[PDB]
Amino acid sequence: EVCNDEVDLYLLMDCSGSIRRHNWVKHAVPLAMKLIQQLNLNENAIHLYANIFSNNAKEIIRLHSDASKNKEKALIIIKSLLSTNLPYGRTNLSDALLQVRKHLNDRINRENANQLVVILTDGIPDSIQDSLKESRKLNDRGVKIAVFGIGQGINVAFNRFLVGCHPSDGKCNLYADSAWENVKNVIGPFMKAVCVEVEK
Numbered sequence: 001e002v003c004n005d006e007v008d009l010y011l012l013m014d015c016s017g018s019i020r021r022h023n024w025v026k027h028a029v030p031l032a033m034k035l036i037q038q039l040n041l042n043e044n045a046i047h048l049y050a051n052i053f054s055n056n057a058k059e060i061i062r063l064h065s066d067a068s069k070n071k072e073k074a075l076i077i078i079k080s081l082l083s084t085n086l087p088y089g090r091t092n093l094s095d096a097l098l099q100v101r102k103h104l105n106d107r108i109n110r111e112n113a114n115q116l117v118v119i120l121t122d123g124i125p126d127s128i129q130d131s132l133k134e135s136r137k138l139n140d141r142g143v144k145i146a147v148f149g150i151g152q153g154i155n156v157a158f159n160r161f162l163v164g165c166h167p168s169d170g171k172c173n174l175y176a177d178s179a180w181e182n183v184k185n186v187i188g189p190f191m192k193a194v195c196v197e198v199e200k
């Protein structure tokens with residue numbers, strides 16, 4: 001797998017109404033699945049955490065749980081997102097990022113592990129101010145943030161700012177975007193690039 005190191009990886013998956021149900025089912029859920037396929041989930045390698053966020057953040061995979069460390073178990077849970085009332089609601093990224101910072105506050109994370117947040121989003125946060133404030137607090141605790149933007153509702157400058165890049169210029173290995181139909185072709189190269197940056 002292209003991601004293979006001691007990393008606590010916090011997947012924050014936008015489930016906002018803008019997505020549309022057909023895209024949630026045909027693209028968003030399969031994209032999260034393929035992303036997880038890029039990870040060596042293992043006690044001594046990657047441990048996954050996952051939440052969804054729209055109105056609020058909701059944990060779906062607990063950090064260090066069996067599904068955190070086992071790809072087949074993680075994929076069952078992600079697939080279970082199909083049998084829900086999702087997608088719906090707004091884009092409370094700051095609450096999603098807050099849940100990550102609560103793990104760090106409470107020392108739930110492996111202190112020895114690289115800390116990586118990966119955001120899948122099709123929009124702009126409802127509060128850029130609070131999202132950037134949370135992101136700074138995470139950065140101060142050593143957390144790297146990556147963003148995979150989808151569709152026409154994103155703001156590239158903001159996503160680039162969030163991950164620590166110049167908003168328009170130069171290579172930004174912690175950022176990629178894609179049209180809805182193409183997400184599964186962009187996610188592999190993205191996760192490869194992200195994991196190279198995390199290891200360096």
Ligand SMILES: [Cl-]
Pocket residue numbers: 091092093094095125126127128130131
């Ligand atoms: Cl927000």
Ligand SMILES: [Mg+2]
Pocket residue numbers: 094095127130131
């Ligand atoms: Mg907030």
Ligand SMILES: [Mg+2]
Pocket residue numbers: 014016017018019090091122123124153
């Ligand atoms: Mg949206």
